[PDB]
Amino acid sequence: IKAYQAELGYHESRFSENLVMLNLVEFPDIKPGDLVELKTYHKNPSASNGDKKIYFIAKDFDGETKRRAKTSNVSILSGQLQTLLDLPSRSRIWIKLKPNKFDLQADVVEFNIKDCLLNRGDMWVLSSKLVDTCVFMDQRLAFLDSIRGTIKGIYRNGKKIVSGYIGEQTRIIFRSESARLIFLIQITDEMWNFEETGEQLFQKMVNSFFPKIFKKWKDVDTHHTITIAFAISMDLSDTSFKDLTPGESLKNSQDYFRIVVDQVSIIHWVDIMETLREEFMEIRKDLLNKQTDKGYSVANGRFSPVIKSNFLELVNFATTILTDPFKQLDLRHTTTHVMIISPGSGLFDVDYSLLRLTGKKLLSLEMTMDLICLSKAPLHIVPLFRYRDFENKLHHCVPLWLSVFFWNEWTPRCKIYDLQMMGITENELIREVDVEYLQLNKKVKSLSEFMNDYDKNAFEVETWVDIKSPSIPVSSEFANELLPIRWKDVWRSFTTPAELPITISDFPSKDDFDRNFIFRNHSVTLNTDQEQYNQTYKDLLRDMIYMRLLTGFQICVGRQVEKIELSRVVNKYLNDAFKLYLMIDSEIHRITCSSSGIIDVERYLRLFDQVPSYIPLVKTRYESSFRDAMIDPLHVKRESLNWNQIDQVLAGDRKWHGFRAKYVVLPTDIPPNTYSMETLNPEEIRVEGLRRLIGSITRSRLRTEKEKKMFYTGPLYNFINEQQPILMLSNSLVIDVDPAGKSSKQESCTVHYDRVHNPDHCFHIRLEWLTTTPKLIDDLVGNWSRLCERYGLKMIEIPWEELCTIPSVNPFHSFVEIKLAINPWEDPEFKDRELFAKSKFYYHVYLLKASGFLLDNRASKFLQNQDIEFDIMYSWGKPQFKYVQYIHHTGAYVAELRENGCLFLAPNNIYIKVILNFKSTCLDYQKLRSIFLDAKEMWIT
Amino acid sequence: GFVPIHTIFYSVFHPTEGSKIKYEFPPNNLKNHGINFNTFKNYIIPKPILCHKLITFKYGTYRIVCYPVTINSPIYARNFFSFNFVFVFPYDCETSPYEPAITRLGKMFKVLEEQNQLLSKSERDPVFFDFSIQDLLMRIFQDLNNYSECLIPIDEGNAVDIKIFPLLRPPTTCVSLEDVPLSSVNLKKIIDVNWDPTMMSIVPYIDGLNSIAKISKLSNSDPGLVIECIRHLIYYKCVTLSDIFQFSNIYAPSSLIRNFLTDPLMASDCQSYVTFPEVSKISNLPLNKFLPTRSCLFDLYRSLSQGQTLKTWYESKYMILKENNIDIRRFITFGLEKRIIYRCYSFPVMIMPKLSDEEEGILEESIRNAETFDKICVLLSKPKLEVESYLNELGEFKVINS
């Protein structure tokens, strides 16, 4: 293959949309659409500019390009590629054509994602658009003209290259610099233990680890949400730690969890570090000063050691927040990465059944537990788990899902605390057992025979991998084998964590497939109502694969899947043959298609009762006392989804729900240009904005291709009986999220909006979506928010679940118990039978209204006066609300009013001073007394 | 042990009058001792190349240890803020235990100044821009001079926690398989939960007569990790290496044989050590078929000689050990532990079943490296006579008892 010398020329984006363009007339030997190497070289490595190998795709010029460009052989779009080339105009370069592409497929093409949510199915679709496309380093790609991406690494044959080619077998890896990161600080006895250099390990954690990781996050300009929680195991026995057997955990223990920083963006790193340092200084007083009922506090309690700590309980506490795939969407962040900071060296004594359950749970969800150890690297292979079997047999195992990093000439890698700290006095560790006394043999009758017999005998004598002994090393290939199979296709993990890879090159063997598997079969077909829309079998098929990727399935391509398919073409992206293989730890799905439209889905389905119940004590950010947790961290798990009904509803309903987000619009300040629109009432222009928003939603209705060719004030029951069986308070509508047609699929979502409105009642917008792209939902919400803010409203995003249920779902979330000081039903200063008969919660409602809390549940039966219209229902279902929820007018915080007068209070972390103000107002005699006095004054007058 | 601090002072770079001392404990200590700050002000606040480095220099009879810190940010005047927590020590000492403390103090104050602008706002003067220092310096000075430790809270979440640790010599690399370890301490009571599992396995087999190969085979451990664990125990000054006891060994008195005489507790410990607890059966065996006095023990320790093996020495003096009930292994071990005798190693330099390929390979490698008989015997797991027979089969050899 000859090398073709050529000139250089640039052009603007107004003339062409391609990257590198050639002339097909000038190069008749090069077919269009072929991988063509570009290199400026004279068969020499001329410093750095002489070695510039850049790939592209052979594409011809345009009519305007042919009419304009005459002296330029190659027309390359200006910008990033021009800067990478660093060549002046009309420079002599060379062109080489490679007819083979599969040998030139890059092994790894990285892709960094910022400030947006991209699902794993969206990554799969983006890689489907990158088939047969050449990329180079630091190239800013795009996806639906809103999702940017920088290619920060291209790898081939173990070598990093500036430019590469993306093929079918290209293991493209998507990493996110906008990600949810959880830090679990393992507070033990070794946090205050000194290292050999002279530093306590928490001093390392707060002065060398966290400042450096925040500096590295700012340097790459990542936009994360950190979540830092302490993690304490307290030993309740008086037995010494030297008497503890290796392998057995502590029998009597109490486990604590202090959430320091909640889901907080990393641009507030000063506040994050301040809260972390203050709470770490206060944790000793919080835990080691127990309260005795005699009226005083006794200094009692001991932190457990790292080896005997509650490590699997900490990991299950971390995995609580990923049990449900269909939770609330963090529309600006992508990856959930958990980092465990420990003062140990990767050695943990664990329970066997809990280890099995922890492995089975970690193999079924998208987290990478990156353990970081503040001690030096030990002499054994890390991470090391020691457990005792049912026959009291010691075992050693290295878990695949845990990766250990160490934060930092001979270095002491073995810890002897009593000799480093000189904890044993010199007179009391003097040697007691000495050399033996030269025992005989009872076969020796001579001293020479004894010497001869002494001189003759003087020199005589799938979630873990079982290490035979920590004191014998492992081979190089065994240490290469230690990596998880679901993450087999991957400082970079700390700063820019990676999502679950779209593909896996592993499969159960033929004997294992017939050993512990059961077979379930589907046959799902297009329905005639959805083919009125532009919906064939192909996009429904990739929507099903989109749902599988959302739950956590990876598309199997490799050798074992091919060798098990022929024992009856494997596919990775999307003709009529679409044989994919999708696998999680629970079940494996074989999906095949045809020209008829029937999708054949075969489910190969594959411990929780042999683990004791475990309810720890959890302190959130806004609490002052340790309270019992509302969820078992061990026994909550990723449930096997009822996939038959999922395929049934994507084809076209108890205990089933999709992705969902409740939306609250709220009255706020009016812009001054709005007041120049007939002079109208602010209430009139706000109801005009509400009507405009409702009309904008009903103008967003998804249409077929065939067709494209009440306001009041006061309580709700007063208005119900004023205009006076099921009364629907909401309307049904199926909208088109994307009207510009950026994506190639159908983006349909279901909208429920409130039929009736009060200025004192929150207005509710519902979005029920299954397979829609979340960025389109986010920009639709942004358009609605701009429309509301133009008319003086404020659309804000709110949890769908009730506030009382969030400690039983998300343990890291802030949640506090509010016990008001002045009880109207007990204190005789404010007590009346008639007032409490007319309004049972009058004082609490006035307290919430005086602090700026708008009401959420208008259909509540705790603030009612009469009952009529026996069945009330929303269009999205029945209101399953236990208490009376209240929303702040700024929407940062959510309140809830119980039946006993105690309030709940929790921030709106999805949207995200006033919280502490309201907590101090509720817990002050003077402020609450003044508010209740004002309430009584308003009641009398 | 640890040198007391002479003067602690906090120097800051003023944007108007340059580098200056802000606070200094003891008050006017530098001027009273003839220390002029303007002589070395360009090392306390140097150029940013020298900054964030442990700078220590000598000024007269004093050694000045500092960690200069420079933070570049547009919030400060002149686009940077520079300070230095400077420690002054006498010259004739070792400032090595204090250097990590000063480095971590500077790094922690760098973190705090980058986070919440602590030191810059503590000046209470808005010319550095676009909690008490003096009390902290007093507390650091007196706590490190009185306790070698400090816990000084400076905020609601920040405290100065400094502990001065001694510096220990690194263990040698000369430890090998044939060396037997002697534990100088009771290793069973030092074992807590933070020990390495390998070391915890090694501990019940360091009895003073087991070789490192024997300890590795007994504990089912790889010899390299046993070597590293013995090295770590050497680093904490608790295990001293020795030799395998054989009756083919050659022991000779050292230059410290007079320490058996000029020591108030060596001979009495020898009497209580080398004697059997009862009338042992070895003290009834023939050669072929009160406690011992200190003079007897000294006469037995002198009678060892170079080139005379322990078999010949014991068969020349066996009525003495039989009548005095003396354990010869315990006698030799006490002599070696007090360094009053030494072992002359045997070196098989060159000019029976069929030996294996790997066995003959390691034998040839041991011969070409001039290794001792002990190392070859350990490597082949054979006594001395089999090794001698195999070497005589392989060639002609001479033995040096050095």
Minimum CA–CA partner of A248 in chain B? B193
Task: Match 């602090």 to its residue by tokens.
Answer: A851
Residue A422 sits at the chain B interface (C-beta within 8 Å) = no
Decide: residue A390, CB within 10 A, 0-12 exposed, 13-18 middle, 19+ buried.
Answer: exposed
CB A367 within 8 A of CB A267: no
Residue B323 sits at the chain A interface (C-beta within 8 Å) = no
Nearest to A451 among B196, B236, B311 (CB): B311
CB A618 within 8 A of CB A811: yes
- Angstrom distance (rounded) from CA A713 to CA A921: 28
Interruption sites in chain A after residues (C→N beyond 2.5 Å): 408, 461, 490, 568, 574, 606, 652, 677, 709, 724, 912
Decide: residue B105, CB within 10 A, 0-12 exposed, 13-18 middle, 19+ buried.
Answer: middle
Omega before residue B26 within 30° of 0, cis: yes
Collect all residues of chain B within an 8 Å Cβ-Cβ radius of residue A440: 281-282
Collect all residues of chain A within an 8 Å Cβ-Cβ radius of residue B377: 458-459
Is the sign of the CA dihedral A620, A621, A622, A626 positive or negative?
positive
Q: Do A281 and B156 touch (CB under 8 A)?
A: yes
- Angstrom distance (rounded) from CA B60 to CA A208: 35
Element (H, E) at A719: helix A716-722
Residue A344: which residues within 8 A CB-CB, separation 6 or more? A186, A188, A190, A306, A307, A309, A373, A375
CB A582 within 8 A of CB A571: no
CB A157 within 8 A of CB A579: no
Omega before residue B100 within 30° of 0, cis: no
- Angstrom distance (rounded) from CA A645 to CA A547: 12
Decide: residue A840, CB within 10 A, 0-12 exposed, 13-18 middle, 19+ buried.
Answer: middle
> Of B215, B234, B166, B161, which is closest to residue B3 (Cα–Cα)?
B166
β partners of residue B149 = B163
**C-alpha torsion angle, residues A838, A843, A844, A849 (rounded to 10):** 100
Element (H, E) at A272: helix A269-288
Element (H, E) at B18: strand B18-25
Q: How far apart are the first and last CA of chain A?
A: 98
CB A228 within 8 A of CB A210: no
- Choose the mutation target among A185, A435, A461 for the interface with B, i.e. most B CBs under 10 Å: A435
Token pair, residue A456, equals 């003759």
CB atoms closer than 10 angstroms to residue B191: 16
From A225's Cα to the closest Cα of chain B, the distance in A is 19
CB B285 within 8 A of CB B346: no
- What 8-state DSSP symbol labels residue A322? G
DSSP secondary structure letters along A550-615: HHT-EEE-SSHHHHHHTT--B-S------BEEEE-SSEEEEEE--SS--EEEEEEE---SSS----
Minimum CA–CA partner of B198 in chain A? A471
> Of B39, B29, B127, which is closest to residue B87 (Cα–Cα)?
B29
CB A242 within 8 A of CB B191: yes
Count Cβ neighbours within 10 Å for each residue of B343-364 and write b for 16 or more, e otherwise: bbbbebeeeeeebeeeeeeebe
- Angstrom distance (rounded) from CA A411 to CA A99: 54
Q: What count of Cα atoms within 13 Å lies in the side-chain half-sphere of residue A304?
A: 26
The rounded Cα B123 to chain-centroid distance in angstroms is: 45
> Of A871, A712, A460, A702, which is closest to residue B380 (Cα–Cα)?
A460
β partners of residue A397 = A385, A466
Strands (E), A108-170: 108-113, 133-136, 140-141, 149-150, 154-156, 159-160, 163-166
Is the sign of the CA dihedral A730, A731, A734, A737 positive or negative?
negative
Element (H, E) at A129: helix A120-129
Q: Do A410 and B159 touch (CB under 8 A)?
A: no
> Of A743, A737, A734, which is closest to residue A778 (Cα–Cα)?
A737
Q: Do A280 and B157 touch (CB under 8 A)?
A: yes
From B194's Cα to the closest Cα of chain A, the distance in A is 6
Collect all residues of chain A within an 8 Å Cβ-Cβ radius of residue B313: none
Residue A378 sits at the chain B interface (C-beta within 8 Å) = yes
Q: Do B276 and A308 touch (CB under 8 A)?
A: no
- Angstrom distance (rounded) from CA B154 to CA B134: 12
Angle at A199 between CA A195 and CA A201, to 5 degrees: 75
- Angstrom distance (rounded) from CA B66 to CA B19: 14
Q: Do B186 and A241 touch (CB under 8 A)?
A: no
- Angstrom distance (rounded) from CA A194 to CA B3: 21
- Angstrom distance (rounded) from CA B282 to CA A277: 69
Angle between helices B373-380 and B357-368 (to 10 degrees): 160
- Using DSSP's 3-state secondary structure scheme, residue A529 falls into coil
CB A593 within 8 A of CB A541: yes
Residues 95-114 of B with CB under 8 A from A: 97, 100-101, 104, 107-108, 111, 114
CB B243 within 8 A of CB B287: no
Phi, psi of A291 (to 5 degrees): -100, 120
- Angstrom distance (rounded) from CA A638 to CA A632: 13
Collect all residues of chain A within an 8 Å Cβ-Cβ radius of residue B315: 447-448
**Secondary-structure breakdown of chain B: helix, strand, coil percentages, each rounded to the nearest 5:** 40, 20, 40
CB A239 within 8 A of CB A279: no
Residues belonging to chain A: 941
Q: Do A241 and B193 touch (CB under 8 A)?
A: yes
Residue A832: which residues within 8 A CB-CB, separation 6 or more? none
**C-alpha torsion angle, residues A687, A692, A698, A700 (rounded to 10):** -140
- Angstrom distance (rounded) from CA A766 to CA B350: 93
Residue A271 sits at the chain B interface (C-beta within 8 Å) = no
Residue A110: which residues within 8 A CB-CB, separation 6 or more? A151, A152, A153, A154, A172, A173, A175
Collect all residues of chain B within an 8 Å Cβ-Cβ radius of residue A454: 246-247
Q: How far apart are the first and last CA of chain B?
A: 40
- Angstrom distance (rounded) from CA A715 to CA A896: 17
CB A621 within 8 A of CB A629: no
DSSP secondary structure letters along B275-324: B-SS--SGGG--S---PPPHHHHHHHHHT--TT--HHHHHHHS-HHHHHT
Token pair, residue A573, equals 């992206």
CB B127 within 8 A of CB B77: yes
Largest CA distance in chain A: 127
- Angstrom distance (rounded) from CA B216 to CA B175: 14
Task: Match 């093409």 to its residue by tokens.
Answer: A109
Count Cβ neighbours within 10 Å for each residue of A2-12 and write b for 16 or more, e otherwise: eebebebbbbe
Residues belonging to chain B: 402
- What 8-state DSSP symbol labels residue A207? I
From A229's Cα to the closest Cα of chain B, the distance in A is 16
- Choose the mutation target among A302, A416, A475 for the interface with B, i.e. most B CBs under 10 Å: A416
Q: Do A455 and B288 touch (CB under 8 A)?
A: no
Interruption sites in chain B after residues (C→N beyond 2.5 Å): 130, 289, 351
β partners of residue A885 = A896
> Of B316, B108, B118, B352, which is closest to residue A207 (Cα–Cα)?
B108
Token pair, residue B243, equals 């030799």
Q: How was this structure determined?
A: cryo-EM
Residue A764: which residues within 8 A CB-CB, separation 6 or more? A662, A663, A664, A730, A752, A753, A754
- Using DSSP's 3-state secondary structure scheme, residue A474 falls into coil
Minimum CA–CA partner of A474 in chain B? B222
**Reported resolution in A?**
2.7
Residue B223 sits at the chain A interface (C-beta within 8 Å) = no
- Angstrom distance (rounded) from CA A300 to CA A298: 6
Collect all residues of chain A within an 8 Å Cβ-Cβ radius of residue B211: 459
Element (H, E) at A341: strand A336-342
Is the sign of the CA dihedral A549, A553, A557, A563 positive or negative?
negative
